[PDB]
Design a protein around this nucleic acid. Structure first.
Length: 1357
RNA sequence: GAUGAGACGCGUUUUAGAGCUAGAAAUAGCAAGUUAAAAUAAGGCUAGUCCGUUAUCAACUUGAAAAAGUGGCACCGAGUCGGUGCUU
DNA sequence: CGTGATTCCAGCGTCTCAAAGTCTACATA
DNA sequence: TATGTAGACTTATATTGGAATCACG
């Protein structure tokens, strides 16, 4: 069996796979083809790509699920309201509710009278005339005290409940006083009454504007205080204003109180918190705080409710009535003005629904903004519309009762109006008095966020727990739901578990055990040196215990001075001590210990370990919740242990935040031999004092083994669940799953022989304004005038050379001279650290100079000469933030620090390793699926080595050796990327085996940086273990080791391993082999078929029409009378071979056609296909001939023409256009697809090659035409493209190449799309017929497409 | 970063808002114009203040199904694989 | 009168939860 | 009066199929 390797490239839209061998040549095999087709043997290369639709997020599903939940909860609330009214309404009217529930049906299908409210035309007309809107009726029922018909009361209550407004506002503000100025004046009056000796002059203070301004509460407080000279924000009046604004002011200082008078109107405890305050200073100040609360309510009402009428109790219904009156008056005035001045526009404005006039604003789809935009010029053109123009500029011209800006309405206003109606109508209806609080509860009820769906399971989003098994109603939710228990489950489920131990609950941030762990972990590294001691010593167990007892348990924060003096001098009698570790202040602290010591006032209780767990259960309660009532309910279990004062003080104490390590990770697991936990080791570890990092990484302890055994595949019940649990986007996880299945299929393909290596690469998944700001700040800090002489826009800064020029302030970075913009093309861009040490494209890693030769010494950093010349200039640029600290250090690396071997190792590590961890998870999954056997030492046998590569290495490999990629040519680039990843990974691990530790999971481990770095100049790689003095990693591939000086160090034609001596690269035939691989016209492109799901149809209720395409919104709602949905998305088509009656002849004519199965009908079709098809009209269906065709089903026609089944009546182009490599390279070079990076001589050679191969352009177009004539069959589009190409033959080569790059989408795989050749627009050619594929060859393709099943549909039947 | 929940305001739609006069009618002219109720993905069985737009995957065989099983190799070339040898 | 070509058109805004960043003014040494 | 700290305000586009329309030989 020949050894082979598998390379894969992972993306969010594609998975590229490639199989390589010992020659780095893609193999080729014969694959059997099943089916009735004549062909039984085919040939396919082992490199290809798999294309699937990107994974879609679940946010849309979450929104369209919460929407259904809300629209089923509102209906239930309305039903409850009806249930309250059932008996009395039935006494008054027996068919009122049936009318209201059958109002939507037409008169023909109605079982009752067509007039809902009264059942007769006369009373309906009278009601509508008397009450044009529901708001008139609501206001009448609020203010008027006369008995009214029960139907009107029910209608008002229903309209109030069904639209109750938001619940954002906190607290209770049922009183409707909202005039800011009047309540501010009353507060000032009360303050002056209480404080006569110290009055406040509020004259000239615009309280309304200041308090109601759209600004922060603190900002408004400061503004208001600024208008009071002798008053401060922290004063009593300032604290009252802050409380009114929603802050939390402390009245302790104002009244010299011992108790901290913290009062917030949002907190539920305020009712007590105020009274307690009134207990100390008396009840004389109560009226002041009540005036403050009234002012707060007025401020909260602010702009949303702005009507000012004293008589009306309802402050919102009168607002709607005033709006309606303004609308009517403005309509009459505008109608008169239009009839007088512009009679020709009257019909267009008041009758054309298609326009954005009044007709379209009322009956059409025109919104308020569109109507304003359409009518502003007409009002400005006419006379007498000054008030109308003012209203338009104030967004109150011809407004409707319902609008877009009623979302600010707090539910308190609707609650108050409903309360007023109930108070005004309960005097005539006993049941309203009996059920007033029930209706108020219905209106105010709202399922708390921490309770969740009231579903007792039977779902995958419910966590609520029940106290009694009965129906939950808004009136009994407190006693039928275990709210306290359910809140704990909520908090726990949406809080991440310990990363090290997925099954262990994490600890609170302020937990006592967690604080002990943090202190000890840090304490296990402190040392002390004195006169008598020869060497600094680790703090022993007894020493650490004494330090904790004397310092950490007596001071919240322990400073280094405190450690030196209070312990070493007081106990150890040490006069001079040096402390290792942190200096000045210790970051860790036992804040919780001192906090509990202050409350309970029982030090022995805290120091007793027996209470430890209990204390934890307290701290958890202080962290788990924030509601004081729930905290009290939980802490009630420990009420016997502490006094009531202590219990209340604990209730007032609250916390937040979580740690990162679990309790079991601290004191749960124990080492096998020692029998000590992590905390036990931290308290005493002899003279080693190993910390947590050392403890969990020590091979001599079981902690590491236990962590490895626990964390490994904690979700490893299967492959789907393990990938799903991984943290990452849905698209990337779908790509991971497809890559794993591709690996399994490839392993099956090659005779069940595991490949030697698996290389994986995962693709990497405004700014001009930022650049402008940075350049402006740097120039203004530097004081230069370069912007005055050279204006520039933000977009122009996207050019690298111009951006670097402005960053350097028009000065050469290596020479103390100026640079010219118009000469930038003759200048040079040079890397500070050369390519020999680090291949990169970072802006900081680049410098704009007149000539690179001026860099002085080039072997190791720019010479000390340039540093001495312009280190001050570099520092000046650094201070202006024009260059970064890293760039400055690299520029001054000549003598800031000698060229470091550590820096070279860091460069190598940065180039090699992968910063992301998701790639590590993918590698672990692949390794666990491949490596399953163990050796004699019970260690894993790593038959398959999994390598992870970054895209930078492959991109640089592509750029160095003229192997270019153009993503918009075809989809082969994914497969080519996978192949190059495989080649690069295999070659890199064969050249330098020691890199396996960096590139493989587990087993192999690093040793140091000394053995990696070689000696100066060329060294013997084979003899000396030294591998690389220069810090490049891929320069062995190329034929010349370049340098910043331009010096050349040629390499042997054949590169081989130093020790083993095996040939790893033959530059004379391996590059040719790669070229031949990339030139292969046959590549396995298979689109992953995926049955479509989602919306039943487009979500837009279309108006009634005479067409069968409409889909009914309800079973009995005929689309011809009530409209319905349109465009049902087809889940998958079904090929049916049956007969249908031929109309009048009544003959069963044999037919074969594609029937689109919609998502709506999918379940019915799958339940019984025969009955569904017979209902559709087909007779004598061949059940065994039924073929399921999901979306993207592949069909082949004559001359290799391929199509994909996009739907039942539309097709997509199914062929790939394999362009020759030379044309691809010419298009890449000529169009400047990427930046023109490289030596100027190389750029000149590339330009010469482009100019000498201009004819390619024509040839390319010719090829495309032929491909169209072979695959596209779009005569009009092809002719237009040819005419456009012949039209712009005089255009520059770069522009023509760029247009051709975006001209390639004519035959791109997938759905057709319109494109632009220069200014010519070519629309997509759509294949609206699927008849031909009924006689083509259906090709079912595997995930890799190496196995294919070809069925001749024409041969069937 | 990945989820998950509780709320709102809309939007859309049919019917209700006797639209009128002069026309034989078509048509003309005139008046009014904001609101309401209902559904908001077909509905299902588990009858829930639940759930239905994310995740799954080619075909066949075995199977209800979670799933397993089902295809030679080398060689030269290369327009989306063509042929040769070997195995067979 | 099928048939190719042309055109439009698609449901959408807000808040809360729960998170840290950062000032800040009353304790605190 | 120079810090510690507890609190509290602040921050956190196009795609593509369907349907109609529209010419049209």
């Amino acid at each position: 069996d020949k050894k082979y390797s598998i390379g894969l490239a992972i993306g969010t839209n594609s998975v590229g796979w490639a199989v390589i061998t010992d020659e780095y040549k893609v193999p080729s095999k014969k694959f059997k083809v099943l089916g009735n087709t004549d062909r039984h043997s085919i040939k396919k290369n082992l490199i290809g790509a798999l294309l699937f639709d990107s994974g879609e997020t679940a946010e849309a599903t979450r929104l369209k699920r919460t929407a259904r939940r809300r629209y089923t909860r509102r209906k239930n609330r309305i039903c409850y309201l009806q249930e309250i009214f059932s008996n009395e309404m039935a006494k008054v009217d027996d068919s009122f509710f049936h009318r209201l529930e059958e109002s939507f049906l037409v008169e023909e299908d109605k079982k009752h009278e067509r007039h809902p409210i009264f059942g007769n035309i006369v009373d309906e007309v009278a009601y509508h005339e008397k009450y044009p809107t529901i708001y008139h009726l609501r206001k009448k029922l609020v203010d008027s005290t006369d008995k009214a018909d029960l139907r009107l009361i029910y209608l008002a209550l229903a309209h109030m409940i069904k639209f109750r407004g938001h619940f954002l506002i906190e607290g209770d503000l049922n009183p409707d006083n909202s005039d800011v100025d009047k309540l501010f004046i009353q507060l000032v009056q009360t303050y002056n009454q209480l404080f006569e000796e110290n009055p406040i002059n509020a004259s000239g203070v615009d309280a309304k504007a200041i308090l109601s301004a759209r600004l922060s509460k603190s900002r408004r407080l400061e503004n208001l205080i600024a208008q009071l000279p002798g008053e401060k924000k922290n004063g009593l009046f300032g604290n009252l204003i802050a409380l009114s604004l929603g802050l939390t002011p402390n009245f302790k200082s104002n009244f010299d109180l011992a108790e901290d008078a913290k009062l917030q109107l949002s907190k539920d405890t305020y009712d007590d918190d105020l009274d307690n305050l009134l207990a100390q200073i008396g009840d004389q100040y109560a009226d002041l705080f009540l005036a403050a609360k009234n002012l707060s309510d007025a401020i909260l009402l602010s702009d949303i409710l702005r009507v000012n009428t004293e008589i009306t109790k309802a402050p919102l219904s009168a607002s709607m009535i005033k709006r309606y009156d303004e609308h009517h008056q403005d309509l009459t005035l505008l109608k008169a003005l239009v009839r007088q001045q512009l009679p020709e526009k009257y019909k267009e404005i008041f009758f054309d629904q298609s326009k954005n006039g009044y007709a379209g604003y009322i009956d059409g789809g025109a919104s308020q903004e569109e109507f304003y935009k359409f009518i502003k010029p007409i009002l400005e053109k006419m006379d007498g519309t000054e008030e109308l123009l003012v209203k338009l500029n104030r967004e109150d011209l011809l407004r409707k009762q319902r609008t877009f800006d009623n979302g600010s309405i707090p539910h308190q206003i609707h609650l108050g109006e409903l309360h007023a109606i109930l108070r005004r109508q309960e005097d005539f209806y006993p049941f309203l008095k009996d059920n007033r609080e029930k209706i108020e509860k219905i209106l105010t009820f709202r399922i708390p966020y921490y309770v969740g769906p009231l579903a007792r399971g039977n779902s995958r989003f419910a966590w609520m727990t029940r106290k009694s098994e009965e129906t939950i109603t808004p009136w009994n939710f407190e006693e039928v739901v275990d709210k306290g228990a359910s809140a704990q489950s909520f908090i726990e489920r949406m809080t991440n578990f310990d990363k090290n131990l997925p099954n262990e609950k994490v600890l609170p941030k302020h937990s006592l055990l967690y604080e002990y762990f943090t202190v000890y972990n840090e304490l296990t590294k402190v040392k002390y040196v004195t006169e008598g001691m020869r060497k600094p010593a680790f703090l022993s167990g007894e020493q650490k215990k004494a330090i904790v007892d004397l310092l950490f348990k007596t001071n919240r924060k322990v400073t280094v001075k405190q450690l030196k003096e209070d312990y070493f001098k007081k106990i150890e009698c040490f006069d001079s001590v040096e402390i290792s570790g942190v200096e000045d202040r210790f970051n860790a602290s036992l804040g919780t210990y001192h906090d509990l010591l202050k409350i309970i006032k029982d030090k022995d209780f805290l120091d007793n370990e027996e209470n430890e767990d209990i204390l934890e259960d307290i701290v958890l309660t202080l962290t788990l919740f924030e509601d004081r009532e729930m905290i009290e309910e939980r802490l009630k279990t420990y009420a016997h242990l502490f006094d009531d004062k202590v219990m209340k003080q604990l209730k007032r104490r609250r916390y937040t935040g979580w740690g990162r390590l679990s309790r079991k990770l601290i004191n749960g697991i124990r080492d096998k031999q020692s029998g000590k936990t992590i905390l036990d080791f931290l308290k005493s570890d002899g003279f080693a004092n190993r910390n947590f990092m050392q403890l969990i990484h020590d091979d001599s302890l079981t902690f590491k083994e236990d962590i490895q055994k626990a964390q490994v595949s904690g979700q490893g019940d299967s492959l789907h669940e393990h990938i799903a649990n991984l943290a990452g986007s849905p698209a990337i996880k779908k790509g991971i799953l497809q890559t794993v299945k591709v690996v399994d299929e490839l392993v099956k393909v090659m005779g069940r022989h595991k490949p030697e290596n698996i290389v994986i690469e995962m693709a990497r998944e405004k700014n001009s304004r930022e650049r402008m700001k940075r350049i402006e700040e740097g120039i203004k800090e530097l004081g230069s005038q370069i912007l005055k002489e050279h204006p520039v826009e933000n977009t122009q800064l996207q050019n690298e050379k111009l951006y670097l020029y402005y960053l350097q302030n028009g000065r050469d970075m290596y020479v103390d001279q100026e640079l010219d913009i118009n000469r930038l093309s003759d200048y040079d861009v040079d890397a500070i650290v050369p390519q020999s040490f680090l291949k990169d494209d970072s802006i900081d890693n680049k410098v704009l100079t007149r000539s690179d030769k001026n860099r002085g010494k080039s072997d190791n950093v720019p010479s000390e000469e340039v540093v001495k010349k312009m280190k001050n200039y570099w520092r000046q640029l650094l201070n202006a933030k024009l260059i970064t600290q890293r760039k400055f250090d690299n520029l001054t690396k000549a003598e800031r620090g000698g060229l470091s071997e550590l820096d070279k190792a860091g460069f190598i590590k940065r180039q090699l390793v992968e910063t992301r961890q998701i790639t590590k998870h993918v590698a672990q999954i692949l390794d666990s699926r491949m490596n399953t056997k163990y050796d004699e030492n019970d260690k894993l046998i790593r038959e398959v080595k999994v390598i992870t590569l970054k895209s930078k290495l492959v991109s640089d490999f592509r750029k160095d050796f003229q192997f270019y990629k153009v993503r918009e040519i075809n989809n082969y680039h994914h497969a080519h990327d996978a192949y190059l990843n495989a080649v690069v990974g295999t070659a890199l691990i064969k050249k330098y085996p020691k890199l396996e530790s960096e590139f493989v999971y587990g087993d192999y481990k690093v040793y140091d940086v000394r053995k990696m770095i070689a000696k100066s100049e060329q060294e013997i790689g084979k003899a000396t273990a030294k591998y690389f003095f220069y810090s490049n990693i891929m320069n062995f591939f190329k034929t010349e080791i370049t340098l910043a000086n331009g010096e050349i160090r040629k390499r042997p034609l054949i590169e081989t391993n130093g020790e083993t001596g095996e040939i790893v690269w033959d530059k004379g035939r391996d590059f040719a082999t790669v070229r031949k691989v990339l030139s292969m016209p046959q590549v396995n492109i298979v689109k992953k078929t995926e049955v479509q799901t989602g919306g039943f149809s487009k979500e837009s209720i279309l108006p009634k029409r005479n067409s069968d395409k409409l889909i009914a919104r309800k079973k009995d709602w005929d689309p011809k009378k009530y409209g319905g949905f349109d465009s049902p998305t087809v889940a998958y088509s079904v090929l049916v071979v049956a007969k249908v009656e031929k109309g009048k002849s009544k003959k069963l004519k044999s037919v074969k056609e594609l029937l689109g199965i919609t998502i709506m009908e999918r379940s019915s079709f799958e339940k019984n296909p025969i009955d569904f098809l017979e209902a559709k009209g087909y007779k004598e269906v061949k059940k065994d001939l039924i073929i399921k065709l999901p979306k993207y089903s592949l069909f082949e026609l004559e001359n290799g023409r391929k199509r994909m089944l996009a739907s039942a009546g539309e097709l997509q182009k199914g062929n790939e256009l394999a362009l020759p490599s030379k044309y691809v390279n010419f298009l890449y070079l000529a169009s400047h697809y990427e930046k023109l990076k490289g030596s100027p001589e190389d750029n000149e050679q590339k330009q010469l090659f482009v100019e000498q191969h201009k004819h390619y352009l024509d040839e390319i177009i010719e090829q495309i035409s032929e491909f169209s004539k072979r695959v596209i069959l779009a005569d009009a589009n092809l002719d237009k493209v040819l005419s456009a190409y012949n039209k712009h033959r005089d255009k520059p080569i770069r522009e023509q190449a760029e247009n051709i790059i975006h001209l390639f989408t004519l035959t791109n795989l997938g759905a057709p799309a319109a494109f632009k050749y220069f200014d010519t627009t070519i629309d997509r050619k759509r294949y609206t017929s699927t008849k031909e594929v009924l006689d083509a060859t259906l090709i079912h393709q595997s995930i890799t497409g190496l196995y294919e099943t070809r069925i001749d549909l024409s041969q069937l039947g």
